[PDB]
Amino acid sequence: DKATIPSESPFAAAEVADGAIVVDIAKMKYETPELHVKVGDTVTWINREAMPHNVHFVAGVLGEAALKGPMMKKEQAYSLTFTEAGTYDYHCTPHPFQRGKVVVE
Template sequence: MKKILALSVGVVTAAALVSGCSGDTDAAGGEPAAVIEVKNMAYTPAQVSIEKGQTVQWRFNDSGMPHDVVGEGQLEGKLESELLTEGTYEYTFDEAGTFDYHCTPHPMMVGTVIVQ
């Protein structure tokens, strides 16, 4: 009986952890709605879709090579990280639209955030 109870508690705990890490939380929930890896000279994924009011997080890890995130169009001067080799940068998108960004030192690195 103790083994069944322990197994049941483990299954319930695992289910709670999985449902709590869905990756679809908005900024108010504390978790980013989308995570973009910045490594291998690319933003991965290069395009994400989120809802208005949600946050995107960029995670930098490209073997010491510095990159940034710089918005184009209406986000020019607003969406702008420092040059980073590691760490994260977050931005909350408050308006719907399609927003492009690039890496200043590597202009071939481009990405898009689609906000519904």
Template sequence: MRNSRGTRRFITALAAAVSLTAVAACGDTKPQSQPIPSASAGDTSSAPSTMPGMSMSPTDAPTGPAVATQSVKIKEFAFGPASITVKVGATVTWTNGDQDPHTVTSQAKDGPLKSATMNNGDTYQYTFTKAGTYNYLCTIHPFMTGTVVVTA
């Protein structure tokens, strides 16, 4: 059974997805794509604070500096920590602790992160072989985002 906070987040996410689908169906036939802003780890000044049709309270927003870890938990519709820093050659493991399914997918079209749909308890691992900043999201819940910074 989901707690009420998780239920509210799920319902908000579902309502936003339905609203965005309805808006997309009513617009002109040209694709409406916008680039996803790139921000350095911990810098949220250029990132949007909300998605259309959704609000995010300050307590829901990821805060703090990048964390040096090799594990990311997926819980209550968020990646935690939202930003991590690892060395080249590190393997990062994502674990889904939600009852809802999630994915870990690179935001860049040619990005390396492409998990299958992960159910509760499932894990996804990726070994980073090149330095850089890897922004990712859950394709099922695109408001869920995270970053892996890989250093030499």
């Protein structure tokens, strides 16, 4: 796999780690739809809305399996630690019109 998952379930926005690279989910979009990070960085998405959201990477992107992240309620967060360079497209499972990518270099 090209990322590790610190927590399989969401956690409170207040618990975001030092040095995490935050992507807000606000106004029904990933507010940073193209994020550039380095190997070893942890990206944390934070849902700021009442509607739940996740991040979903199809098979072959983060690794062999799809990664269907857990649904984040309002003011919850979810992280991925990227361990290899690449370009990692994702969408929101219930809202597939909501798309983003993480470029790891």
